[PDB]
């Protein structure tokens, strides 16, 4: 059994786990877990041990998968590892970049997909599929960076008229930044890039949904009339991601009314999505930044 690499996507909550994953993790002879991609993901390296068998699970880190990532593509004997994320290794981690090199350097890849909290979080919102966009991360204040191009990428999916996905960073404790401080943030990247972009700033004004995908179909949809409001509230603990849609279609407003327990019509800004369309018009989001 030649060098083989299974990258394998455990799902992001117990019970969540294909058959085929649980199949491939058994056979592998080795399994290293990471659960630093995926905040509250304590629970992981319980559910492969158990999966496994205790004698070959075994933690990696950060450093381990990035700096020393020529270990884990062990062409030094010939056998099989795998490398099990919760959620899927091709969403929103860098893996990508370990198959690429154990690709070239011989070892056969195999990519064992699982369901994602992104696309369950997209899914529980109910908006149309086809028109989300790009996806972003809003930097929690340890990392020392106003998100300028961050919010630049969120007017161009809006000029688009696709729906934004956000993500919340994680720190070293692996414990998620609040919804409040992530968009708190991400306003002052607004007023800071519309200011040099030579615009009025108009995320705080635009509506929201706050989501955390669960497990049995528990997941819980959140509306929020506007990112200011999200901004400033300390709302219950959770893994979220936020959706900033664009303009919603006539049948998206009653699916999202649906799903997050609202009704219609659902109350939001009745000029931003207009002012941000001028801007959009006027070339004022493509520099770039």
């Not at 877990?33 to 041990?49: A, F, R």
């Not at 099989?80 to 011989?106: F, I, N, Q, R, Y």
């Not at 692996?174 to 030579?198: C, F, I, K, T």
């Not at 979220?240 to 019509?265: D, F, H, K, N, T």
């Amino acid at each position: 059994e030649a060098v083989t690499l299974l990258l394998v996507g455990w799902g992001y909550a117990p019970g969540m786990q294909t058959l085929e994953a649980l199949d491939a993790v058994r056979r592998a002879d080795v399994v290293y877990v990471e659960s630093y991609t995926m905040p509250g993901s304590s629970w992981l390296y319980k559910s492969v041990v158990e999966a496994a068998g205790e004698a070959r699970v075994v933690e990696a880190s950060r450093r381990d998968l990035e700096e020393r990532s020529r270990e884990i593509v062990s062409r030094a004997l010939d056998a099989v590892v795998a490398v099990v994320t919760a959620g899927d290794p091709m969403v929103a981690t860098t893996h990508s970049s370990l198959a690429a090199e154990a690709l070239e350097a011989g070892v056969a890849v195999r990519y064992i997909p699982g369901v994602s909290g992104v696309q369950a979080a997209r899914g529980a919102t109910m908006l149309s599929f086809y028109r989300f966009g790009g996806t972003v991360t809003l930097p929690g204040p340890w990392r020392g960076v106003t998100p300028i191009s961050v919010a630049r990428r969120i007017y161009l999916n809006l000029c688009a008229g696709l729906h934004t996905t956000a993500l919340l960073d994680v720190d070293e404790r692996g414990v998620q930044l609040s919804p409040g401080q992530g968009v708190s943030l991400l306003l002052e990247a607004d007023r800071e890039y519309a200011r040099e972009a030579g615009a009025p700033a108009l995320l705080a004004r635009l509506p929201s949904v706050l989501v955390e995908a669960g497990a049995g179909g528990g997941h819980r949809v959140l509306y929020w009339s506007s990112l200011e409001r999200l901004s400033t509230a300390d709302v219950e603990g959770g893994v979220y991601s936020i959706v900033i849609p664009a303009r919603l279609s006539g049948v998206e407003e009653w699916l999202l009314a649906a799903a997050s327990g609202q009704r219609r019509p659902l109350e939001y800004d009745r000029s931003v999505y207009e002012t941000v369309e001028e801007n959009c018009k006027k070339g004022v989001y493509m520099e770039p930044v």
